[PDB]
Design an enzyme around this catalytic site. Structure first.
Site, PDB file in Angstrom:
ATOM      1  N   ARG A  10       0.918  -1.213  -0.037  1.00 43.60           N
ATOM      2  CA  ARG A  10       0.090   0.095  -0.073  1.00 43.60           C
ATOM      3  C   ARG A  10       0.798   1.302   0.078  1.00 43.60           C
ATOM      4  O   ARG A  10       0.453   2.297  -0.461  1.00 43.60           O
ATOM      5  CB  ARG A  10      -0.769   0.097   1.223  1.00 43.60           C
ATOM      6  CG  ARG A  10      -1.710   1.445   1.217  1.00 43.60           C
ATOM      7  CD  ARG A  10      -2.533   1.261   2.567  1.00 43.60           C
ATOM      8  NE  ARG A  10      -1.897   0.973   3.955  1.00 43.60           N
ATOM      9  CZ  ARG A  10      -1.388   2.091   4.298  1.00 43.60           C
ATOM     10  NH1 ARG A  10      -1.603   3.332   4.090  1.00 43.60           N
ATOM     11  NH2 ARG A  10      -0.875   1.644   5.793  1.00 43.60           N
ATOM     12  N   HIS A  12       4.056   1.692  -0.863  1.00 47.23           N
ATOM     13  CA  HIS A  12       5.246   1.807  -1.930  1.00 47.23           C
ATOM     14  C   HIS A  12       5.140   0.981  -3.440  1.00 47.23           C
ATOM     15  O   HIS A  12       5.788   1.487  -4.228  1.00 47.23           O
ATOM     16  CB  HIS A  12       6.564   1.128  -1.343  1.00 47.23           C
ATOM     17  CG  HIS A  12       6.923   1.791  -0.122  1.00 47.23           C
ATOM     18  ND1 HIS A  12       7.138   3.090   0.182  1.00 47.23           N
ATOM     19  CD2 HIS A  12       7.054   1.293   1.411  1.00 47.23           C
ATOM     20  CE1 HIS A  12       7.631   3.374   1.094  1.00 47.23           C
ATOM     21  NE2 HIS A  12       7.418   2.356   2.108  1.00 47.23           N
ATOM     22  N   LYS A  41       2.295  11.872   5.937  1.00 48.70           N
ATOM     23  CA  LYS A  41       3.522  11.251   5.991  1.00 48.70           C
ATOM     24  C   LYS A  41       4.630  12.137   5.339  1.00 48.70           C
ATOM     25  O   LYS A  41       4.233  12.644   4.281  1.00 48.70           O
ATOM     26  CB  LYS A  41       3.178   9.882   5.189  1.00 48.70           C
ATOM     27  CG  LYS A  41       4.566   8.995   5.418  1.00 48.70           C
ATOM     28  CD  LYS A  41       4.322   7.690   4.920  1.00 48.70           C
ATOM     29  CE  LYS A  41       5.271   6.517   4.992  1.00 48.70           C
ATOM     30  NZ  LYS A  41       6.639   6.265   4.265  1.00 48.70           N
ATOM     31  N   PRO A  42       5.791  12.565   6.007  1.00 47.78           N
ATOM     32  CA  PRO A  42       6.759  13.333   5.116  1.00 47.78           C
ATOM     33  C   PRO A  42       7.360  12.942   4.102  1.00 47.78           C
ATOM     34  O   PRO A  42       7.414  13.884   3.075  1.00 47.78           O
ATOM     35  CB  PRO A  42       7.640  13.436   6.460  1.00 47.78           C
ATOM     36  CG  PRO A  42       7.567  12.257   7.284  1.00 47.78           C
ATOM     37  CD  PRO A  42       6.186  11.949   7.447  1.00 47.78           C
ATOM     38  N   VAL A  43       7.709  11.805   4.058  1.00 49.78           N
ATOM     39  CA  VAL A  43       8.357  11.180   2.867  1.00 49.78           C
ATOM     40  C   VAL A  43       8.064   9.832   2.401  1.00 49.78           C
ATOM     41  O   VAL A  43       7.689   8.904   3.290  1.00 49.78           O
ATOM     42  CB  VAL A  43      10.061  11.199   3.225  1.00 49.78           C
ATOM     43  CG1 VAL A  43      10.752  10.465   2.116  1.00 49.78           C
ATOM     44  CG2 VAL A  43      10.666  12.583   3.569  1.00 49.78           C
ATOM     45  N   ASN A  44       7.674   9.519   1.168  1.00 51.82           N
ATOM     46  CA  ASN A  44       7.148   8.262   0.814  1.00 51.82           C
ATOM     47  C   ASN A  44       7.735   8.029  -0.575  1.00 51.82           C
ATOM     48  O   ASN A  44       7.021   8.886  -1.544  1.00 51.82           O
ATOM     49  CB  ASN A  44       5.712   8.126   0.757  1.00 51.82           C
ATOM     50  CG  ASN A  44       5.245   6.643   0.691  1.00 51.82           C
ATOM     51  OD1 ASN A  44       5.604   5.932   1.622  1.00 51.82           O
ATOM     52  ND2 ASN A  44       4.405   6.387  -0.235  1.00 51.82           N
ATOM     53  N   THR A  45       8.347   6.976  -0.850  1.00 49.43           N
ATOM     54  CA  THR A  45       8.665   6.692  -2.207  1.00 49.43           C
ATOM     55  C   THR A  45       7.682   5.470  -3.000  1.00 49.43           C
ATOM     56  O   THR A  45       7.244   4.603  -2.096  1.00 49.43           O
ATOM     57  CB  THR A  45      10.060   5.971  -2.227  1.00 49.43           C
ATOM     58  OG1 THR A  45      11.041   6.894  -1.692  1.00 49.43           O
ATOM     59  CG2 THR A  45      10.486   5.690  -3.843  1.00 49.43           C
ATOM     60  N   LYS A  66      20.432   0.759   6.260  1.00 50.52           N
ATOM     61  CA  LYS A  66      20.854   2.040   7.021  1.00 50.52           C
ATOM     62  C   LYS A  66      20.904   1.740   8.472  1.00 50.52           C
ATOM     63  O   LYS A  66      21.764   2.458   9.036  1.00 50.52           O
ATOM     64  CB  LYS A  66      20.167   3.205   6.763  1.00 50.52           C
ATOM     65  CG  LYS A  66      20.562   3.871   5.294  1.00 50.52           C
ATOM     66  CD  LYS A  66      19.322   4.816   4.782  1.00 50.52           C
ATOM     67  CE  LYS A  66      19.493   4.877   3.475  1.00 50.52           C
ATOM     68  NZ  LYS A  66      20.858   5.770   2.986  1.00 50.52           N
ATOM     69  N   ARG A  85       7.640  13.961  -1.227  1.00 54.85           N
ATOM     70  CA  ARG A  85       8.121  14.730   0.166  1.00 54.85           C
ATOM     71  C   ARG A  85       7.319  16.085   0.473  1.00 54.85           C
ATOM     72  O   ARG A  85       7.017  16.914  -0.756  1.00 54.85           O
ATOM     73  CB  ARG A  85       9.520  15.033  -0.158  1.00 54.85           C
ATOM     74  CG  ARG A  85      10.582  13.827   0.004  1.00 54.85           C
ATOM     75  CD  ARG A  85      11.761  14.401   0.081  1.00 54.85           C
ATOM     76  NE  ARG A  85      12.696  12.987   0.346  1.00 54.85           N
ATOM     77  CZ  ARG A  85      13.465  12.806   1.410  1.00 54.85           C
ATOM     78  NH1 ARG A  85      13.779  13.593   2.277  1.00 54.85           N
ATOM     79  NH2 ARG A  85      14.138  11.711   1.520  1.00 54.85           N
ATOM     80  N   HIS A 119      10.075  -3.317   4.018  1.00 55.05           N
ATOM     81  CA  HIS A 119      10.243  -1.759   4.385  1.00 55.05           C
ATOM     82  C   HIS A 119      11.008  -1.246   3.256  1.00 55.05           C
ATOM     83  O   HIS A 119      11.866  -1.936   2.528  1.00 55.05           O
ATOM     84  CB  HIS A 119      11.243  -1.627   5.507  1.00 55.05           C
ATOM     85  CG  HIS A 119      10.526  -1.968   6.924  1.00 55.05           C
ATOM     86  ND1 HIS A 119       9.468  -1.375   7.424  1.00 55.05           N
ATOM     87  CD2 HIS A 119      10.865  -2.893   7.657  1.00 55.05           C
ATOM     88  CE1 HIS A 119       9.139  -1.780   8.548  1.00 55.05           C
ATOM     89  NE2 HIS A 119      10.090  -2.697   8.571  1.00 55.05           N
ATOM     90  N   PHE A 120      10.680   0.077   2.876  1.00 58.77           N
ATOM     91  CA  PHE A 120      11.700   0.552   1.678  1.00 58.77           C
ATOM     92  C   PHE A 120      12.613   1.454   2.302  1.00 58.77           C
ATOM     93  O   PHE A 120      12.633   2.472   3.017  1.00 58.77           O
ATOM     94  CB  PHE A 120      10.883   1.659   1.017  1.00 58.77           C
ATOM     95  CG  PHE A 120      11.583   2.087  -0.298  1.00 58.77           C
ATOM     96  CD1 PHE A 120      12.211   3.331  -0.377  1.00 58.77           C
ATOM     97  CD2 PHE A 120      11.171   1.471  -1.452  1.00 58.77           C
ATOM     98  CE1 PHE A 120      12.880   3.788  -1.379  1.00 58.77           C
ATOM     99  CE2 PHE A 120      11.903   1.842  -2.556  1.00 58.77           C
ATOM    100  CZ  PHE A 120      12.774   2.996  -2.700  1.00 58.77           C
ATOM    101  N   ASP A 121      14.228   0.993   2.202  1.00 56.09           N
ATOM    102  CA  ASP A 121      15.230   1.521   2.799  1.00 56.09           C
ATOM    103  C   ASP A 121      15.732   3.017   2.358  1.00 56.09           C
ATOM    104  O   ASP A 121      15.948   3.747   2.862  1.00 56.09           O
ATOM    105  CB  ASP A 121      16.250   0.611   3.004  1.00 56.09           C
ATOM    106  CG  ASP A 121      17.101   1.012   4.143  1.00 56.09           C
ATOM    107  OD1 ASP A 121      16.576   1.258   5.160  1.00 56.09           O
ATOM    108  OD2 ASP A 121      18.184   0.832   4.105  1.00 56.09           O
TER     109      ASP A 121
END
Ligand SMILES: [Cl-]
Ligand SMILES: [Cl-]
Ligand SMILES: [Cl-]
Length: 124
Positions: A10, A12, A41-45, A66, A85, A119-121
């Site tokens: 959902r 990514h 959400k601040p950042v999402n790819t 990371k 973003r 998870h998207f790293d």
């Protein structure tokens, strides 16, 4: 509760388009994927490849995440992605996002059986 794999799907995956079509792509997608419900959400790819190609990354190049965990994988090939973003004028409940389309390798953390992205790293 949403499973970790479903949450990754959902947040990514957007296999419906080859790439962001306009500057308003992120505003629309962050809203439709329910990533602005209670807060922005601040950042999402988002990844513009098939779900099967994203899942296949879990058997590609093993690399450190990371945070130092060792269950991350970097796609051998570049993939179409869009980074979303928040801009400076963004403020809940009036979220606002900058849309940046790019072609990069993705790095995801994988887990479970089947062994899939949870998870998207980062992207490279
Ligand atoms: Cl679900
Ligand atoms: Cl699932
Ligand atoms: Cl992200």
């Amino acid at each position: 509760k949403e499973t970790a794999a479903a949450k990754f799907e959902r947040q990514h995956m957007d296999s419906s388009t080859s790439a962001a079509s306009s500057s308003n792509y992120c505003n629309q997608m962050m809203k439709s994927r329910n990533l602005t419900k209670d807060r922005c959400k601040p950042v999402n790819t988002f990844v513009h490849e098939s779900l099967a190609d994203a899942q296949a990354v879990c058997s590609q190049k093993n690399v450190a995440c990371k945070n130092g965990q060792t269950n991350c994988y970097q796609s051998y090939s570049t993939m179409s992605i869009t980074d979303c973003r928040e801009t400076g004028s963004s403020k809940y409940p009036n979220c606002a996002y900058k849309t940046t389309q790019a072609n990069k390798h993705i790095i995801v953390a994988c887990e479970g059986n089947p062994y899939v992205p949870v998870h998207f790293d980062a992207s490279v």
